[PDB]
């Protein structure tokens with residue numbers, strides 16, 4: 442019923458992409474066939490409803506694909522409902538303190554690790570369970586990932602990543618570059634310095650290393666060299682814009698084309 | 701309010717793609733930005749509802765993108781409603797006789813060119829019109845395209861393309877290759893022989909030439925050389941599968957990736 446942490450725990454590299462536009466649940470089958478392990482629904486910067494997410498999850502659960510959600514704020518409404526619906530976990534944006542992680546974990550974990558409420562029906566994928574065992578096992582499979590976008594978070598990174606229940610760390614390069622006063626220069630040496638500092642803290646704290654690259658898959662080499670297991674590349678929108686624009690341009694450049 | 705025939709009439713080459721998966725209406729804005737003139741909603745092989753099409757059209761009407769629909773059969777329910785909703789016209793699949801075209805035109809054109817019923821509201825994009833002039837002008841802008849998929853249609857092509865109101869002709873290479881007993885061999889010389897025969901008839905009948913290529917944009921050169929104005933390349937699904945699979949594969953091939 443849960444696929445992501447099992448892979449990470451076995452030392453595997455896993456590959457995901459962002460989902461910002463498409464809500465047709467067949468995108469899940471396309472992504473499975475393309476060899477993706479997971480994808481992240483962008484509820485921070487897009488309009489996805491919880492019903493749409495349920496539809497995605499319903500297809501993903503039997504396709505062997507994990508659904509994570511990037512939530513706009515940490516509260517019970519987001520965390521409780523999305524885990525109950527069947528997202529395997531979260532990317533928490535702009536994490537700046539241990540407290541944000543403590544609160545995420547409190548909402549996401551069943552007692553005694555947290556205060557997540559125990560529901561039924563879709564919660565257990567409509568299957569019967571041994572409750573006492575099941576809550577313990579599920580707590581071990583919920584995935585929590587901190588996204589770092591602030592210089593201040595980088596400076597305080599050990600405190601953030603030492604919180605019990607934090608599974609992985611990743612970056613938001615655009616916001617981070619903005620915080621460095623060089624918005625959009627996501628390949629700047631100062632940005633990579635931040636990455637390095639965070640990766641060293643992740644190593645110290647036993648936290649999985651993640652990396653996002655927005656356009657060129659080859660740029661993931663940098664993260665893979667450094668032992669990053671959570672690989673997040675591009676997204677549906679970039680796929681549609683990049684592929685479509687390229688072909689159209691090729692066509693409009695054919696000899697005989699009449700503009 | 702209508703964009704496609706105006707371009708074709710001016711001798712322009714125009715570029716479109718198939719829509720089979722995405723129904724988020726923002727796909728229209730993505731396609732406009734990518735430089736597409738039109739796209740074709742696949743109602744023959746996919747699940748699109750007329751409401752979904754209305755949503756697409758509502759965005760397209762002010763984006764300067766034309767929406768065509770590939771309908772599964774020619775009847776009043778499809779033709780009347782879709783034109784009223786705001787599709788600029790149709791790709792009619794597997795056309796095998798003049799009669800199919802006569803019936804398409806009868807349903808699609810206002811009197812005296814046809815028997816299309818005159819409605820209101822969305823029909824005129826919610827704008828007031830001079831009815832007597834407006835129906836005449838609209839009849840000149842409705843787009844009807846015959847898709848050829850049978851050897852028998854190729855043999856009878858002059859009769860099919862001579863029907864008044866037929867604007868353009870195109871091919872369904874997979875079905876055509878199937879009818880030639882070589883299903884899937886869409887680059888076979890026998891397939892191109894058919895194309896040539898149809899193009900010669902299109903020239904004789906004053907009908908616009910169209911061409912579909914499923915994967916490689918460069919293969920459109922063949923059609924462009926031959927004066928084809930209706931260029932139809934790939935589609936949203938191929939875009940998502942091709943782009944995504946490529947990047948994922950690149951990532952999984954990085955040194956240090958742990959499968």
Ligand SMILES: [Zn+2]
Pocket residue numbers: 462463464465721722723724
């Ligand atoms: Zn969609």
